[PDB]
Amino acid sequence: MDELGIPVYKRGFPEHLLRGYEFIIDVGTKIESVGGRHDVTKIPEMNAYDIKQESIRTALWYNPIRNDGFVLPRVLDITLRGYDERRAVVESTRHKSFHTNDQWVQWMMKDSMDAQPLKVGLDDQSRNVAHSLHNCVVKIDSKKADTMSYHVEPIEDASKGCLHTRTMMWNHLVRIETFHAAQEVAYTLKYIYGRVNLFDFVAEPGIKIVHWEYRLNHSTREITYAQGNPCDLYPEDDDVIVTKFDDVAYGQMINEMINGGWNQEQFKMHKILKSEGNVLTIDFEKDAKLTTNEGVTMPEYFNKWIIAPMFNAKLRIKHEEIAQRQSDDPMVKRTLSPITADPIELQRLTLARFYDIRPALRGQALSRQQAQSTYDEEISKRQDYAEILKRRGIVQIPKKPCPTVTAQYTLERYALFIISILQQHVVRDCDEEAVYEHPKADHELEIFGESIVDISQVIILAFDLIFERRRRVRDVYESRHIIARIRRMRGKERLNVIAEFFPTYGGLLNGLNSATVVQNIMYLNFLPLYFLVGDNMIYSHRQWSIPLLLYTHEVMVVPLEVGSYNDRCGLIAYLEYMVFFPSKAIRFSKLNEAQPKIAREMLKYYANTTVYDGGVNYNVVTTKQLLYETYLASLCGGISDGIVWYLPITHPNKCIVAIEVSDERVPASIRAGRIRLRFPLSARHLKGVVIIQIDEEGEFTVYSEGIVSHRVCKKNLLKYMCDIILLKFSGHVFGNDEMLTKLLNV
């Protein structure tokens, strides 16, 4: 009750002796610094928050097995907001009783990229759960322990334009494939030939390969709204193969569909293209035959361009000299005439049989300091960099951007691009006599004012703006639960929680039994946007294809595989077809006979598709937050260790006090502000914040906010001696109850 003290001792203070206290700082066993950073490399050795030592993209996919299980940093905030928001419901006697939304708190608990896996140094002669940390071992009495977690933070470095609260967002980018560097697929002799991935080809410049060139058939037509950027199937270019839709197969598909409903399993994009020579079937290891005579016969397209208008692609194979030799950091383009740098271009290369991507990071997972991958500075030279960064509130401009700068760039330009693409499928009411460059992003676009941080946010926004005309971005948790809640339902009820959040939109696909013109059917294409993307999901089975309408002159319903002929997920799978939309005349057409029934089938298919559902490895995928935290610390930084744990207070009001032990490097107050950040929606309960800051020399120094009040003083049991940080909470009883376990078990 009222004031705890926390003794902080260096060996050899016995601590047989200190067990009376509830929290202890042993300053003690330090980890030596390797000047001037203190070295993350010892982490797998100390205990720790396990991160095996490894080249960093194979840290991403890592498992982890040296922990004792996972704490979530926000579990306290999760259930404080859980408890704050209970429904009242009147009882049989007229008393209220308060029901937890205990299913939003389940969903909120899973679906949490925070989670970190720690190894504690738990001993069996005392009840104490030790956490090693670079300057001290902190030992919490187990009753207080459940909330404790690291609050590691890499040093913001102003020349790089750092903003490290965006770390999570970075990690989220990588998970949804928008931080990768690319490279076209390549072959060599190992039938003869065989694919060889270019990131690690270990070959000197001046040696030949065969490699797919792969450009957009043409990004950015100069289109006018009476036209549409319809994807005409008949380019008039000499001596290039074009891929054609096969009418007899496509007709059979549509009849199977109008009768038996849409078939995700058995419908296929490759199946409705004429074989000579369709992009989805052709292969190179299986097409350059041995043969018998006279030999070395390359497949009949081996220098020709192959325009593929449905995919807006234009890939051709070739012999090509490589450059730049091998190196460990994509993007260093691995050949003369390579494939594109800019990340929103890669979002457009639907066919992904033709290139490999790995996330653009470089080197050891635990390094105290290493040169950054060049990808950031390479995104930086992009035109439209300065202009899109201004929306981010970055007035100019890092010369060697930290990843989070280019994370911010990437996700903001991405959002602009997805909206400028999608705005075309709604009706527009403006002069069609105004040419404009079509799939250009807007920059001047008006949206405000919760800053973009998640594609789920961009999706909620695609509907909120295109349909609701609510030009406003929702909080990341509100949107992730919006999508989660749409997916959670099937059948008609899924259509009810759409049109609960987007009433005009669902209110206009609820209505499609009317649907006279093609414009009315045209709204179905937005549907894939729920099921197609998120940092933590994998497709139930990639190679299922979901229905879509591409707009050539006549509105064909293609199946697009999710995705994308390369087990990548997602929003590549889908986004690029959407860059085609009908000419205004095709956009009024007044349907025909089969179109209403195809649309009824499409919406009925999405109404209960579960294509997003295939089970993720939660253990692998959510756990990586501390990996990016310390890796990024190596890129700028270095790191600053620190655990925080929350001490519940129970009178007069029920309220949390964060207590925080940490490295001396970043100043206490800013660290306290960041502490308040782990309460995205419950900050109001966090009523005061102690921050003990142990020096590298073992020279600690407290700091505190409201409700708490520290005062340091020596304790001298005979020869043995050490400081006890007293912590008065004047006016607040806080002791004898299961407050913490009540607080969590909400």
C-beta of 158 vs 290, nearer to Zn ion = 158
Q: Is 722 among the annotated ligand-binding positions?
A: no
Minimal distance, residue 633 CB to Zn ion, in Å: 9
The minimum distance between CB 636 and Zn ion, in angstroms, equals 4
> Is 452 an interacting residue with respect to Zn ion (CB under 5 A)?
no
Closer of 606 and 631 to Zn ion (Cβ): 631
Beta bridge partners of 686: 656
- What x/- string results for residues 580 through 619 when contact with Zn ion is judged by CB under 5 A? ----------------------------------------
Helix, strand counts (H, E) of the chain: 23, 23
3-state secondary structure 658-695: EEEEEECCCCHHHHHHHHHCCCCCCHHHEEEEEEEEEC
162 binds Zn ion (CB under 5 A): yes
Q: Tell me the residue nearest to Zn ion as measured from the CB.
A: 402
- Name the one range near Zn ion by CB under 5 A: 129-137, 243-251, 540-548, 635-643: 635-643
What lies within 8 Å, CB to CB, of 189 at 6+ separation is: none
For residues 170-187, one letter each, b for 16 or more C-beta atoms within 10 angstroms of the residue's C-beta and e for the rest, the string is: bbbbbbbbbbbbbbbbbb
- 3-class secondary structure, 236: coil
C-alpha torsion 278→279→281→283, nearest 10: 120
What's the min distance (Å) between Cβ of 164 and Zn ion?
6
Strand partners, 24: 139
Taken as a whole, the chain contains a residue count of 746
User: Residue type for 394, please?
Assistant: I
Q: For Zn ion, give the closer residue by CB, 47 or 380.
A: 380
Q: Which part of the chain contacts Zn ion (CB under 5 A), choosing from 63-71, 109-117, 158-166, 241-249?
A: 158-166
Closer of 145 and 402 to Zn ion (Cβ): 402
Cβ proximity to Zn ion: between 162 and 315 the closer is: 162
Alpha-carbon Rg for the chain, nearest whole angstrom, is 29
Stated as kind and residue range, the H or E segment containing 171 is helix 167-175
The CB-of-153 to Zn ion minimum distance in angstroms stands at: 11
User: Contact between 639 and Zn ion (CB under 5 A)?
Assistant: no
Quote the least distance from Cβ 652 to Zn ion, whole Å: 43
d(CA 725, CA 8): 7
Alpha carbon distance 626, 492 (integer Å): 41
The 10 Å Cβ neighbour count of residue 323 is 14
Q: How far is the CB of 403 from Zn ion (least distance, A)?
A: 7
Number of residues that bind Zn ion (CB under 5 A): 3
Select 403 or 559, whichever has its Cβ closest to Zn ion: 403
Q: Please, what is the minimum distance in Å from the beta carbon of residue 405 to Zn ion?
A: 7
Q: Which residues does residue 657 pair with via DSSP β-bridges, in sequence order?
A: 647, 688
Q: What character string, x for contact with Zn ion (CB under 5 A) and - otherwise, covers 387-416?
A: ---------------x--------------
DSSP output for 466-490? HTT----PPPHHHHHHHHHHHHH--
Nearer to Zn ion, 402 or 658 (CB): 402
Question: How many Å separate Cα 460 from the centre of its chain?
Answer: 15
169 binds Zn ion (CB under 5 A): no
**Contact between 636 and Zn ion (CB under 5 A)?**
yes
With respect to Zn ion, which residue has the nearer C-beta, 153 or 356? 153
HSE-CB at 257 with a 13 A cutoff on CA atoms is 33
| Smallest separation (angstroms) from Zn ion to the CB of 385 | 17
Beta-strand relationship, 87-90 and 709-715: unpaired
Q: Which residues, 692 to 721, sit near Zn ion by CB under 5 A?
A: none
One-letter amino acid for residue 300 of the chain: E
To Zn ion, the closest distance from the beta carbon of 222 in angstroms equals: 39
Judged by CB under 5 A, the stretch of 301-309, 358-366, 453-461, 631-639 that binds Zn ion is 631-639
Nearer to Zn ion, 422 or 636 (CB): 636
d(CA 678, CA 76): 9
Residue that the structure tokens 């419908």 belong to: 267
Is 136 annotated as ligand-binding?
Answer: no
Separation CA 323–CA 334 (nearest Å):
6
In the complex with Zn ion, which residue's Cβ is closer, 160 or 487? 160
- CB of residue 662 to Zn ion, shortest distance in Å: 19
Binding part of the chain for Zn ion, among 154-162, 178-186, 307-315, 530-538 by CB under 5 A, reads 154-162
Amino acid at 380: S
By beta-carbon proximity to Zn ion, the closer residue of 288 and 636 is 636
Burial class (CB in 10 A: 0-12, 13-18, 19+), 462: buried
Helical segments of 532-681, H only? 572-575, 584-588, 594-606, 618-621, 625-635, 668-676
CB of 161 to Zn ion, least distance (A): 8
Q: Where are the beta strands (DSSP E) in 269-413?
A: 316-321, 355-359
The annotation places the binding site for Zn(2+) at: 162, 164, 402, 636
The annotation places the binding site at: 162, 164, 402, 636
Contacting residues toward Zn ion, per CB under 5 A = 162, 402, 636
